[PDB]
Design a protein around this ligand. Structure first.
Ligand SMILES: Nc1ccn([C@@H]2O[C@H](COP(=O)(O)CP(=O)(O)OP(=O)(O)O)[C@@H](O)[C@H]2O)c(=O)n1
Lengths: 199, 76, 101
RNA sequence: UGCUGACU
DNA sequence: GCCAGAGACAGCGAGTCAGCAA
DNA sequence: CTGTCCTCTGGC
């Protein structure tokens, strides 16, 4: 019954990850304890969640928990079919051992039609975003980046870079070309604000 | 129009240097010198009286510039 | 690889830095006509940036691209069009290059 | 240029 | 194609004064 | 005298 503890931690972390992306999540899911998780729900196909977005109610996300410890191209297709038929665009695949290396470039191959993304199970046992040293990241909107570049007379290159595989760019699901504001809690100035172009 | 109103120390240094190099090349002194042979003392005397017709052209990191007057600049 | 790198260089020359990964993904999802349309659209809509291309983060990308090319794609290989075109140049100490039969 | 001493 | 075997290869504080031999 | 390259080589 440690499998259930792992399932509960991963589900709580994914609920927090979905709330930080701006999806409609209730307080109970974010404050759900183990005794009630196991009360509700055992399997790995009824842990799949489907969440809606604050705006764009059609824009929803779908979280998978594949059974195969090493997901492959066929496993990816089997529920890319589910997504294509239910009419969703985004997904999130929590894998237990990894993805066979061809799969990673397949997930990338699926054009903005159906954009997927993978997360290891050991990466979700804790919320890195809740570490002391990790600042708060905020994906800037297309109209705030323009005002930033205009205030500092900048170009989008010539800005600090954040890797597209950064453990906190993968969590906040930030695509390339997006600028993220970062609020460092500084011992010197309190709440220093920086900006990083995702690339 | 958006940069600091005061005159940085580097600007004071360069303005004094240039005014002194001008005075030394036989330029008219608008400060009524009183027996001093140093052009840098004369340049300081002029800076204190707010008589220096030079235009500090502050360059921003993208090529854009702002032209300030040495008179319209708070000397500390 | 030849055409991908050609287009990536064409876009780097003007500064466009997202075009690099965009071209690579356009390729993998798919050759010259597929890539040259996007690359010309970039180089046209993003010109006026030949002076704003001599910045760090634009030199690192070109450095990495050309280094990876010279390091991974210039090894002796059986020839594509004629299967027996490995006239193995193999250079001894400088001032010496030896082709075989 | 070199090499052998020496100074802070 | 995956990653050891290496085997090159490059770096190694600042300034100063002499003499002697080639 | 150390650490990365980094260009093979070599085996697999
Ligand atoms: N090779 C060297 C030797 C010396 N120096 C410089 O000379 C200073 C005095 O040397 P020093 O040997 O007299 C040390 P100090 O603390 O003054 O000695 P004390 O305990 O007897 O009072 C050092 O601190 C360096 O700045 C150098 O640059 N390279």
């Amino acid at each position: 019954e440690e499998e259930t503890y792992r399932l509960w931690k991963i589900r709580k972390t994914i609920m927090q990850l979905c709330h930080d992306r701006g999806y409609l999540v209730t307080q109970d899911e974010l404050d759900q304890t183990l005794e009630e998780f196991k009360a509700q729900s055992p399997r790995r196909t009824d842990l799949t969640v489907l969440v809606a977005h604050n705006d764009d109610p059609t824009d929803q996300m779908f979280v998978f928990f594949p059974e195969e410890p090493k997901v492959g191209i066929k496993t990816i297709k089997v529920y890319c079919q589910r997504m294509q038929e239910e009419n969703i665009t985004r997904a999130l695949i929590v894998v237990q051992q990894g993805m066979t290396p061809s799969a990673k470039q397949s997930l990338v191959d699926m054009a903005p039609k159906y954009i997927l993304e993978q997360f290891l199970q050991q990466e979700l046992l804790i919320n890195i975003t809740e570490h002391e040293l990790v600042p708060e990241h905020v994906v800037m909107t297309k109209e705030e980046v323009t005002e930033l570049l205009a205030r500092y007379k900048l170009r989008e290159n010539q800005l600090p870079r954040i890797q597209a595989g950064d453990p906190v760019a993968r969590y906040f699901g930030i695509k390339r070309g997006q600028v993220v504001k970062i609020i460092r809690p500084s011992e010197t100035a309190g709440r220093y604000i920086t900006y990083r172009l995702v690339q | 129009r958006i940069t600091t109103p005061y005159m940085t120390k580097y600007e004071r240094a360069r303005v004094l240097g240039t005014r002194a190099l001008q005075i030394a090349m036989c330029a008219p002194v608008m400060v009524e010198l009183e027996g001093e042979t140093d052009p840098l003392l004369i340049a300081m005397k002029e800076l204190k009286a707010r008589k220096i017709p030079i235009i500090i052209r502050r360059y921003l990191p993208d090529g854009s510039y702002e032209d300030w007057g040495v008179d319209e600049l708070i000397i500390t | 690889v030849i055409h991908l790198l050609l287009c990536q260089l064409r876009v780097l020359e003007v500064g466009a830095l997202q075009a690099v990964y965009e071209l690579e993904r356009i390729l993998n999802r798919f050759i010259r006509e597929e890539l040259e349309q996007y690359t010309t659209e970039i180089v046209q809509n993003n010109l006026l940036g030949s002076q704003g291309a001599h910045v760090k983060n634009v030199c690192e990308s070109k450095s990495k691209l050309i280094a990876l090319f010279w390091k991974a794609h210039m090894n002796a290989k059986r020839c594509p069009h004629c299967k027996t075109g490995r006239s193995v140049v193999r250079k001894e100490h400088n001032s010496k290059l030896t082709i075989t039969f």
